Amino acid sequence: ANQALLLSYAVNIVAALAIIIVGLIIARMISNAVNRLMISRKIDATVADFLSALVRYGIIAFTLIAALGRVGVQTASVIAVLGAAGLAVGLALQGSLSNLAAGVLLVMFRPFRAGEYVDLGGVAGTVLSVQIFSTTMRTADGKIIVIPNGKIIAGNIINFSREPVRRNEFIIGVAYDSDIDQVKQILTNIIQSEDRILKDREMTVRLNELGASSINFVVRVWSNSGDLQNVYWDVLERIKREFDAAGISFPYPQMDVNFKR
Amino acid sequence: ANQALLLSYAVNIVAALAIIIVGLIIARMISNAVNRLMISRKIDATVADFLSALVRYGIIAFTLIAALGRVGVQTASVIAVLGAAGLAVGLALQGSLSNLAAGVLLVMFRPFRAGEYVDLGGVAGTVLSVQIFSTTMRTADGKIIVIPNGKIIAGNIINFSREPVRRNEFIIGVAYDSDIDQVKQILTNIIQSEDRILKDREMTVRLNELGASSINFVVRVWSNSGDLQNVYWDVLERIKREFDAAGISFPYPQMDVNFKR
Amino acid sequence: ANQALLLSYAVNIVAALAIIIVGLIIARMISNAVNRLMISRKIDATVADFLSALVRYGIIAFTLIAALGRVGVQTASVIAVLGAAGLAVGLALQGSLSNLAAGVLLVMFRPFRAGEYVDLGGVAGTVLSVQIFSTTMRTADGKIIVIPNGKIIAGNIINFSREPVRRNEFIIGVAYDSDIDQVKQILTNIIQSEDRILKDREMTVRLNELGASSINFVVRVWSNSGDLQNVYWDVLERIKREFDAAGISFPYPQMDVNFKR
Amino acid sequence: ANQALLLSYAVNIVAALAIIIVGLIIARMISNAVNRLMISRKIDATVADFLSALVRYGIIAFTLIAALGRVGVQTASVIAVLGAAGLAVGLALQGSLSNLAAGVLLVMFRPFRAGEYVDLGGVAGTVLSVQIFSTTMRTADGKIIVIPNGKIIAGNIINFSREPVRRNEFIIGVAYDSDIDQVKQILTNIIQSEDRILKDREMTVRLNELGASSINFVVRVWSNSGDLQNVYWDVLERIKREFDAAGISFPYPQMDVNFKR
Amino acid sequence: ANQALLLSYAVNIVAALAIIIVGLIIARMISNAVNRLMISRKIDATVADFLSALVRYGIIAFTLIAALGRVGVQTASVIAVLGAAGLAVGLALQGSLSNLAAGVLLVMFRPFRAGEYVDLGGVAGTVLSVQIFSTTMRTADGKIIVIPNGKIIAGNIINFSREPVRRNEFIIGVAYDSDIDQVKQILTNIIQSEDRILKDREMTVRLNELGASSINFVVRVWSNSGDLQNVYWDVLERIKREFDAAGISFPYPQMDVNFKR
Amino acid sequence: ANQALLLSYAVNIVAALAIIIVGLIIARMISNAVNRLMISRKIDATVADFLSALVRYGIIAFTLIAALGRVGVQTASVIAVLGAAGLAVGLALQGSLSNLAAGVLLVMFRPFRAGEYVDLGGVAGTVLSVQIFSTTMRTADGKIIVIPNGKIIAGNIINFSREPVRRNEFIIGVAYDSDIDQVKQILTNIIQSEDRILKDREMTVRLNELGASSINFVVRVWSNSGDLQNVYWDVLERIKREFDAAGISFPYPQMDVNFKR
Amino acid sequence: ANQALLLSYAVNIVAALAIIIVGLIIARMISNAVNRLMISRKIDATVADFLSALVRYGIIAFTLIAALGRVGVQTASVIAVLGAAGLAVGLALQGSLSNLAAGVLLVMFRPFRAGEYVDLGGVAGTVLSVQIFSTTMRTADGKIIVIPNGKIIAGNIINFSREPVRRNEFIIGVAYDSDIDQVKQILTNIIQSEDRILKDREMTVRLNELGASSINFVVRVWSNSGDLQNVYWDVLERIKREFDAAGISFPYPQMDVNFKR
Q1: C-alpha F94 chain-centroid distance
Q2: After which residues does chain E show a gap where C to N exceeds 2.5 Å?
Q3: What whole-number distance in Å separates Cα of residue B93 and Cα of residue B95?
Q4: Torsion sign over Cα E175, E181, E184, E190
């Protein structure tokens, strides 16, 4: 009956039992605290129960393997398996965490605001709100699109309404017989008569190219962002009316045919 | 016959034997408990047996290498191999775990509900149900599509029926000789006569562009989500009837030919 | 001639020799057991021999480095190299393991069954069987396609025959001079005369759009899944016969030509 | 002159020298054994020499750092660097190892055999042989394609000759004036006169659609895999001859023109 | 009542209590310091509070597990879980960190400057500013685009205004009957009359190809970057005027028709 | 003045100083040896100096942290940082190492040889040489393409000249009025008159399809690889001459027009 | 008042204080040295200050946790967090490091030189210089493109000017009535009259195909790299002149029309 080694072993076993008992009570208390906190705010019953069960299982596994290590059982392989499981969970949650970080960045740097008409990688609409994981926008068609923030941060973010002034472009295709200077002066008169077109900005009216069936002119004018569509429609209808009155004819697809027999 | 070192070795070997025996009985008991639990609920026989065999093999490997470590055999390489295998399994299960996390997020944030007509990255249909891993939707054609939740969370989620009001768009192509104001007033009268078109929303009737063979007008009106298709059909048929009665002719593809010889 | 340290060294060397000898016999016995088990069931000779050789090499390396560690040679670098090799093997087997997990999920959740006509990401066919790694389907052409389960789980799974009722769609292009109400009533009579078209489902017969050379009507009717193709063919032939009898003419590509000189 | 600590240090230095000397002789002997084994079979001189040099360098590094650790120099950073290098090599060899695993799977499950005409993700040809890393197929053009097995396992594997019976499809475009029943009965007579067309399989002869310039019929018949092309050619030529004899005319692209001025 | 082991245990427990108390006060002090520093500069209240809470939780977890380790509870599994969480966070923040590094590189090497018209992988505009994470450019249309720096560093960066001289290219399509030397000399005279075209640079005027309906000439001239568009427009209008005066006719799409019956 | 612990500390400090001094001299000697070896063969001065500096810095860091560990400073965090840096370097060099492994595989298995006309994923040319990292080929146009070996190993490798015999295919489009048997016999006579066409291989001359404006025949013949282009040209010119002599007319795009008004 | 354990604790605390003080002075001295070195060469003030701050923070964290470990506080979790941060930084810098390695390889193997006209994955231009991270090329248009070296190493590198001789190809489309031998002899005479066309290289003049409206000949000739464009232009203009003189007519798009009513 040794008094040193046996007492050391008794200390080890009592310490292991204390460790496991304290771990059990700690897991129970933290489970109760988490349940109370989740009750204190909005939460789903099923998801909250799953979360509490998962954290309880984790803590009881921790204390069980700690007691095993104190007893003398090597738990290095169990630690390796737990690390592998944690890495698997991290890889699984990589996407959601990346979306969360992207949402944080979007909140911080404010590339776009609520109620701001923007285009995000092929989808354009007025932003309603930005959440932690994904934004919500309403298209001009009236559809609702929910875009995760990670793919928003990736790629360009076109902000339409950041600049108060935007430029219109008109492609006018008239017949080759039309008088170049006459067309240019008619277009210039139309541009001058318009009050919503900025006068200090460049007003480009030039012959752009020679198409297959027509000669294409380019008309580039700037206007306020909130009036661009109306300016475009007004200038287009005015151009059509003026060309019809002045005899300028928009040509149909031309063709040159040669007869055989 | 030493009394300290030999007794220490005897303690080590007896402890190793106790560890392996306890590990075997623990593996057997946990296997029985898992089998009973899987019997208590719905499970496949083959899959349940494979799962029980895998967990049994894992636990017996744990206790065997623990006994080896207690005896004195270094098991660091075995731990390295087991960690590599765990990492391989984690990488393999990354996709399924990501789908599970995405499904949890879809349940939580509720981007779309059951019975809600939505479009998910090129496929549109009415959602039937959302499971842990994948959703199910029925297309308007009547087909069933099962979409994993990970690729739903990735990319945009178009929700058609979230907004009660959606906008229609009509592209009317009439001949260049038609009277612009007459066409506009006919379209406006048609829009006014329609009761299902919202009057407080913007009712756009403008000349949109000058096409190759026709002048294109744009007609944009809003209506309730549940009547959009009928409104479109009614307005289209009414437009055709009114243009036929009023003499406005939709032009066939025009061509200008010039003869040689 | 010391009696403590030298005896400790003798214990160490004898223990190392015992460890390596036991490792060799254990490797031989497990190799024999694996060979016997592989003989007891279906296996390839070359692949089984390679597997047995690989596991034998692994076990002998384990016991050799364990003996080195017991002797006193540090094997941490060898453990690092073995861990790197295990990680490389895990990355290599990631694809096959992912396919296995996907196959397990396909068995469990049963998105599609054997003999069920489905479309899987661009390939459509009747499923023959689902294996652990890949499925087999026969296309309507008669071809055999083997699809790994991972890419099945990734992306949508269109199930054609899950819903007993599917909807047909007919696009009828008639000349602009045709009477809208006459065409609609002829189509409605044809739909009513058909017994295989469900009457309780919506039977849509509306003017869909105004094409370049014709006005397009939309005919949407539902029918049983096993009769959809025959219903389509019958309705199409009936429509052609009725339009030919009633004088409704399907227009050829129209063109409007204007002569110069 | 202490007798315990100094003797311990002498033991340490002698053990380190023994370790390094034994490591050198072991590296030399294993290098000789590897060289002899590579001589005993087919190998490249340059590649074999590089492999032997690499393994020799690895073993000498192992024994050198082991001697350093025995002396008392901590080699944890060296172990970290070696682990990083091993991980880099594993990532580099991931592709080749994945190809090897894919080849093993292809050998095991036998999705396709030698001399079997298959299509593998856009390339179709008769398989010549399957190696450890890549297969070889000959296209019908006579070209040789070497396909790595990893990208074969990824994606679908279309096996043309697995099913002894395949289905042909004929798209016949005849003028709108042609008699539907007459065309159907002529096609049916042609199908019946053919002996290589399976009679127990479905023989589909229906009006498929109404094209822009013609009405398209669908003819679907099954035949043996080794006669499909000849059956197609024979049926096509027979159809042309019968339609020419019976007056059925395949229409050229139709056009409806309207004159102005 | 032992005096060595019990005193050692008392030292351990007192040291653990000291460690946890010092950890708590250190966490509180560093939280106060971080809050003060964030108050001293621009910061969001919510984000700053979340950051302080996260760092406080991290530090208290560190000191709690340190106290557990001092007491004697093994915390290796907790360390494994914390390492997995850290790896998950690192993978999540990989994108933002890559953008930060790319922005640093863009600042250092200066591929483009503010106010410099450039094209970045499909989007072209004048750069306004470069931030830590993303740049801002204004397109010629007037739109604002925010581009993350990582995708700028990836792929090419076209710098339009780095070179003071750029080359124009004119594609002139004239009828086959036109005189080649006459067209060449007219184009050369037009090029010579232009003062904004560099004379020391190559002035290419050659017959480029034989098109379907015309023979295409290539005109390549260099000019200053700030005058390229005006030079193009002037040369184009001058070419049209000179060809109209000289009788050179730009041909409409030719066609050769042959009559049957 | 203790004689045990103080002497132990003196041993520790002297051992640390010896370790650092030996590390410095070893780093210097290995740097000199590496510089001499790089001088003995072809090397760049800048790259060699950078490599020597990097290895010197690595070795001095190793010995410095080893001396710190011997003194008693824990260097685990430094080891963690060094491991992270090594992993970063491994990820950076992954691409180059993968190219090296792919080049080794290409040398070993010999999918293609020097001077062998092959196509490698969209680029076709005659291979000049294969290096450790990338190959070089000359296209038929005369251009030089350098292809990294990794993307060669990935994807298919089309070897044109591996098979001595390749098959030609001729698509002949003749008018619908032409006599099928007459065309077939003319083509067969042309095929028979050709001596470079293999007679034992299948010589396919069949009516392939019914095109929009012509009936398409398929002519498939085999020939030696070194004469395929000349055989194609000769057969094509012979076919044109024979059809022109025999009255068979290749039809221009047909059109059927119907007049209105 | 014990004299062994208390003196050991005093040694530990004094050693910890010495470690932290030495760490602080070492961090300060290395910060001063780094600042001096960065002053001695070109550097940005902001970036240099950030780098010095980062390295100072790293070193002070190292020494602080070392002092904690010496005192007795376990810092394993802190080491885990630092390792996670290092891995995150490594993943972030992976792209830049890969670009650096690719640039080193480009310098070493010299796939292309400065002033060498090459095409790099869709962009072609004359290379100006190659830096550590990215190259710079000027397109023939005069634009400047900066290409990171990683995407240069990935994918093919087309080197236009490596081969002194390149081959031209001319596609000549003449009417079906033209005499084949006459066209061939005219083309051959044109090829012979050209002195810049290599005579020892193959001069291919054959009928290539039968197009919809013309018969296409292929003309393939080789020339020096620095004269290819001029040779092409000269041969093209000569061909047009000779065909116009000899009566050979390049046909316009043919059409065969058939009249109804």
Answers
A1: 17
A2: none
A3: 5
A4: negative
| Residue positions counted in chain A | 261
CA dist G101 and B140 (Å) reads 53
Considering the four listed CATH numbers 3.90.830.10, 3.40.50.11740, 3.90.25.10, 3.30.70.100, the one that applies to the domain covering E165-246 is 3.30.70.100
Write out the CATH class of domain F110-159. mainly beta
From residue C47, give the alpha-carbon distance in Å to each of C32, C42, D100, D108.
16, 11, 12, 8
- C213 and D260 within 8 Å at the Cβ level: the answer is no
Question: Is the CB of C84 less than 8 angstroms away from the CB of D79?
Answer: no
Chain A residues touching residue B62 (CB < 8 angstroms): 77-78
* Other beta carbons less than 10 A from residue D189's beta carbon: 12
CATH 1.10.287.1260 in chain B: give the residue spans: 5-106
Q: Extract the tokens encoding C151.
A: 């890419």
- Per CB-CB distance under 8 Å, the chain D contacts of C145 are 156-159
* CATH tag for C111-159 (out of 3.10.300.10, 3.90.1150.10, 2.30.30.60, 3.30.460.80): 2.30.30.60
Question: Which A residues, 135 through 194, put their C-beta within 8 Å of a C-beta on chain B?
Answer: 138, 140-148, 151, 173
Q: Do B142 and C222 touch (CB under 8 A)?
A: yes
Residues in CB range of E224: below 8 A, 6 or more apart? E164, E165, E196, E198
Q: Which residue ranges does chain G devote to CATH 2.30.30.60?
A: 110-159
DSSP chain F: --SSHHHHHHHHHHHHHHHHHHHHHHHHHHHHHHHHHHHHS---HHHHHHHHHHHHHHHHHHHHHHHHHHHT---HHHHHHHHHHHHHHHHHHHHHHHHHHHHHHHHHH-SS-TT-EEEETTEEEEEEEE-SSEEEEE-TTS-EEEEEHHHHHSS-EEESSSSSEEEEEEEEEE-TTS-HHHHHHHHHHHHHH-SSB-SSS--EEEEEEE-SSSEEEEEEEEEEGGGHHHHHHHHHHHHHHHHHHHT--PPP-EEEEEEE-
Evaluate whether F93 touches G101 at the Cβ level (below 8 Å).
yes
Residue with the two structure tokens 């497990």? C30
- For chain E, the chains sharing at least 3 beta-carbon pairs closer than 8 angstroms are A, G
Report d(CA F149, CA F141) in Å as an integer.
Answer: 22
Residue A13 to residues A9, A67, C40, E50, F44: CA-CA distances in angstroms?
A: 6, 9, 47, 42, 67
Q: Which two tokens stand for residue D171?
A: 């798209």
Interatomic CA distance for residues F109 and F112, integer angstroms: 9
Q: Specify the DSSP element, H or E, that contains B67.
A: helix B45-71
Amino acid at position A133, single letter: F
Are E64 and E6 spatial neighbours (Cβ–Cβ below 8 Å)?
A: no
Say whether B240 and C210 touch across the interface (CB within 8 A): yes
Rounded Cα gap, residues G23 and G20, in angstroms: 5
CB contact under 8 A, C77 and D87: no
Alpha carbon of residue A3 to chain centroid: 71
Asked if C163 contacts B142 with a C-beta cutoff of 8 angstroms, the reply is yes
Alpha helices in G72-113 (DSSP H): 76-109
d(CA D239, CA D231): 12
Structure tokens at A133: 């994981």
Neighbour subunits, G (≥3 Cβ pairs < 8 A):
E, F
Q: Give the dihedral of Cα atoms C61, C65, C70, C75; nearest 10 deg.
A: -170
Chain C touches chain G, with at least 3 Cβ pairs below 8 Å, answer: no
Q: Rounded distance, CA G187 to CA B72, Å?
A: 90
Q: Which of F61, F98, F258 sits opposite D257 (nearest CB)?
A: F258
Tally of CB atoms within 10 A around F227 = 13
Please check whether residue B233 touches C, CB under 8 A: yes
State the CATH class of domain G5-106.
Answer: mainly alpha
